[PDB]
UniProtKB/TrEMBL annotation, chain A:
Then it catalyzes the NAD-dependent ring dehydrogenation of precorrin-2 to yield sirohydrochlorin. Finally, it catalyzes the ferrochelation of sirohydrochlorin to yield siroheme. This is Siroheme synthase. InterPro entries: 4pyrrol_Mease, 4pyrrol_Methylase_sf, 4pyrrole_Mease_sub1, 4pyrrole_Mease_sub2, CobA/CysG_C, NAD(P)-bd_dom_sf, Siro_Cobalamin_biosynth, Sirohaem_synt_dimer_dom_sf. It comes from the Bacteria. In the N-terminal section; belongs to the precorrin-2 dehydrogenase / sirohydrochlorin ferrochelatase family. It comes from Salmonella typhimurium.
TrEMBL record, chain B:
It catalyses: uroporphyrinogen III + 2 S-adenosyl-L-methionine = precorrin-2 + 2 S-adenosyl-L-homocysteine + H(+); siroheme + 2 H(+) = sirohydrochlorin + Fe(2+); precorrin-2 + NAD(+) = sirohydrochlorin + NADH + 2 H(+). GO terms for biological process: cobalamin biosynthetic process; methylation; siroheme biosynthetic process. NAD(+) binds at residues 22-23, 43-44. The modification Phosphoserine is found at residue 128. This is Siroheme synthase. Residues 216-447 are annotated as: Uroporphyrinogen-III C-methyltransferase. The gene is cysG. Its EC number is 2.1.1.107, 1.3.1.76, 4.99.1.4. In the N-terminal section; belongs to the precorrin-2 dehydrogenase / sirohydrochlorin ferrochelatase family. Belongs to the precorrin methyltransferase family. Residues 150-207 form the Sirohaem synthase dimerisation domain. S-adenosyl-L-methionine binds at residues 225, 297-299, 302, 327-328, 374, 403. Residues 1-204 are annotated as: Precorrin-2 dehydrogenase / sirohydrochlorin ferrochelatase. Then it catalyzes the NAD-dependent ring dehydrogenation of precorrin-2 to yield sirohydrochlorin. Finally, it catalyzes the ferrochelation of sirohydrochlorin to yield siroheme. Pfam families: CysG_dimeriser, NAD_binding_7, Sirohm_synth_M, TP_methylase.
Length: 451, 447
């Protein structure tokens, strides 16, 4: 990220503003509300500074820039119409390692001032960092509608209750379940906004009195095929609240940036199946919230059954959030609809390699009026070509390989069945093989990109 | 306001973390993402730190806390398990005037680290001062729902574009109208994420050429099978930005309660309307420069006639895109604990509809999972034919109605009972056939 947002405590720490105009006034108001020991140093001051100094709220220094005035400071704002003066200020703050802002120069200096949405003690800060101020206000105003008025009271009462919550509940898990119930209690919100104390207490006493679930849980989340926008809402809620995230090769970096930063992540790519079973089973033993994060959907060739089969008997609660399967994702982003009129009456999702022995029922796969979708069949492309032709499938039946479907690295190569072998050589895992006449619809429905 | 939020530029600035365990590792990652020149002081390090140190990404100093490591620093963090050490670190930084955070302790620290939504250069940070970290997590979840991943890309592009926003827009009011269709034109967003620097121009000048009130595009969106949680992020973002939503019965009211309240709605499903009228409505309301959203149950490209609706629009030069969804098979499989595949039970899943004729011997072959969409009526003759073509009569069968919804009914049993069990349900329902249906007695977590 281009900036690290932090929330400074300014009470009784000195700060310098240099400059004394309408801009300098706005920043000075911000620093005064935050309880800072302020010095303004300018050649002339608009009247608002004159009144603030009368009431003993800041110190005024009339004259040119005095570097020594930095010596005690935690923040400097350069706020004059003289670039030469502003840079001297920025250069003095840099030698003293003091974060400095220049109002005329977002790209110079050390910090940027964001727009603020006050719901004290709740604060949301927005900034596009100077590139877009329009999107800042557009975002700021939209955020202003989403956050209720009484959100401040809930948050103020939450802090007052924080001591009582730490003595009464022992572990971290049950304080979490307390706070989750607390912040979605609309009755408790209206009672605070109505200053009705008897009703605040009644609801508070009942909450402290509820037995809390000590058990851990495991949730199988389908991560979808790659684009981070194809995750489901439910699946975002799970990885934004999870304690541990067990993920594998086929979950993208964009999806992983959506995990809660203070959760631990275990990798299981390249590890076999019975180990994943136990590591899940082990991390759920600590009574934590375990997310098993799987590419695609977890019941389409992800062996989500094997994982959950252990835990029906080991008394662990579990559930599953479905995901966009690679087939649905690659079809929408390749322009290739999986069904269409009666091009296809059915769609077959097939595995590329079986349990050592056992042959695919090629007679069945060769049937007409169906879209064929081979999962992990790349290394067996040539034999699928042979066998399909052996069992009746025509020769000019179109085919497409969608490598890395739904990401920004998506390649699509197409052709006819007799080219299936050579098409596979110019693609790499992870790839899908689509076979059927719906592939011809591509040159009319491709909206994603010319690679 | 007793904390002032500032956005710090940390690239190439000395920053200090004291502590070498898991919490330090999460703060070190955070500060490494932002380009800090980072040192880490600890009596020992978890391996992840020795890795970062070998890739030359930070510096490790093993030993007790040395307050001289603060000599050239801009931010400090206490992240050890020892309150004595954290207090020492906290006190070494206040006399130097280095802003400092104590992970263990919001109070007794000169700065608090908020929750962040990163869309660089666009950033959103949420805190409530240590009072309510769960409530900030809840705010962060919602904000991540609402902001497209690639918004930062378009944020940036707007940068060297403010040039042209004046020599082709005079008033600040129209200037903002343009800016408003800019940040919501996902065709530009995808074009920038995919580096296709010609789809970017073709849409940059279409934005300066087309009338200011024209934003005409169509977005096919999968509603999913019924549960409002099963919508996609991009799906939700799209129905927040819609001028019109054209929807049918197969879209649940939970999903419709997510659609912006100041948006036109055309109900197009049935009452008690052929495909081509739906095509004309979409075409019609798109030529008027309105941002159209076609909302369809499940997934648009699986028995949704999604293909038909988009070849009406490819004639008239109307931009479009498709946000896929959870088809009924996936949902109903998950919310009934019947996985479509499991071990070597089934080499293939078959999603089938219920002119021409269905190939019967194919449907009976072993090592399959049959899923019948729109098949409740033909359900009688389906049990006859599968038996007549050699499928074992003890083949488990299940019918899932209103899958993934708070009124979901599941009915299971055996293929011999197939005709009896299909009376006990109503559309919308799924017929699932195969040996995986026997797994529900161990995997059903919904009911
Ligand atoms: N983004 C993608 N593009 C193309 N193929 C993909 C893909 N993601 C997964 N696959 C295919 O899926 C195989 C793993 S099987 C697991 C996939 C999961 N059951 C699902 O529903 O998607 C890979 O070998 C690859 O062939
Ligand atoms: N919530 C639900 N529960 C059970 N079946 C459903 C369902 N929603 C859709 N269906 C099935 O899907 C059929 C609608 S036609 C296709 C639906 C959608 N395109 C999808 O991807 O699912 C119905 O006849 C029914 O069989
Ligand atoms: Cl907080």
């Amino acid at each position: 990220m281009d900036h690290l947002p932090i929330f400074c405590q300014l009470r009784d720490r000195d700060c310098l503003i240099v400059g004394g105009g309408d801009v300098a006034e706005r920043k000075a108001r911000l620093l005064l509300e935050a309880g800072a020991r302020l010095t303004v140093n300018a050649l002339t001051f608009i009247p608002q500074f004159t009144v603030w100094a009368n009431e003993g709220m800041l110190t005024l220094v009339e004259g040119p820039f005095d570097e020594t005035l930095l010596d005690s400071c935690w923040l400097a704002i350069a706020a004059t119409d003289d670039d030469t003066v502003n840079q001297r200020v920025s250069d003095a703050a840099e030698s003293r390692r003091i974060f400095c802002n220049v109002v005329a120069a977002p790209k110079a200096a050390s910090f940027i001032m964001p727009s603020i949405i006050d719901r004290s003690p709740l604060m949301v800060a927005v900034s596009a960092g100077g590139t877009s101020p329009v999107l800042a206000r557009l975002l700021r105003e939209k955020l202003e509608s989403l956050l209720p008025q009484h959100l401040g009271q809930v948050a103020r009462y939450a802090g007052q209750l924080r001591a009582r919550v730490k003595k009464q509940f022992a572990t971290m898990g049950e304080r979490r379940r307390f706070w989750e119930k607390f912040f979605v209690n609309d009755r408790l919100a209206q009672s605070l906004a109505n200053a009705d104390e008897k009703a605040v207490n009644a609801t508070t006493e009942r909450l402290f009195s509820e037995p809390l679930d000590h058990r851990g849980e495991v949730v199988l989340v389908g991560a979808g095929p790659g684009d981070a926008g194809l995750l489901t809402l439910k699946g975002l809620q799970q990885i934004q609240q999870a304690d541990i995230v067990v993920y594998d090769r086929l979950v993208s970096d964009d999806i992983m940036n959506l995990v809660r930063r203070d959760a631990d992540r275990v990798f299981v790519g390249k590890v076999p199946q019975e180990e994943i079973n136990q590591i899940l089973l082990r991390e759920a033993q600590k009574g934590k919230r375990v997310v098993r994060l799987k590419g695609g959907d977890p019941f389409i060739f992800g062996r989500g059954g094997e994982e959950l089969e252990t835990l029906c008997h080991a008394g662990i609660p579990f559930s599953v959030v479905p995901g966009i399967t690679a087939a649905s994702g690659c079809s929408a982003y390749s322009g290739i609809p999986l069904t269409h009129r009666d091009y296809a009456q059915s769609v077959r999702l097939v595995t590329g390699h079986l349990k050592t022995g056992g042959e695919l029922d090629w007679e069945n796969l060769a049937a007409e009026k169906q879209t064929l979708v081979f999962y992990m069949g790349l290394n067996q492309a040539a034999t699928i070509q042979e066998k399909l032709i052996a069992f009746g499938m025509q020769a000019d039946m179109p085919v497409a390989l969608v490598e890395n479907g739904t990401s920004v690295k998506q390649r699509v190569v197409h052709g006819v069945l007799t080219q299936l072998g050579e098409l596979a050589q110019q693609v790499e895992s992870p790839a899908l093989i689509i076979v059927g006449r719906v592939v011809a619809l591509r040159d009319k429905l491709n909206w994603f990109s010319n690679h």
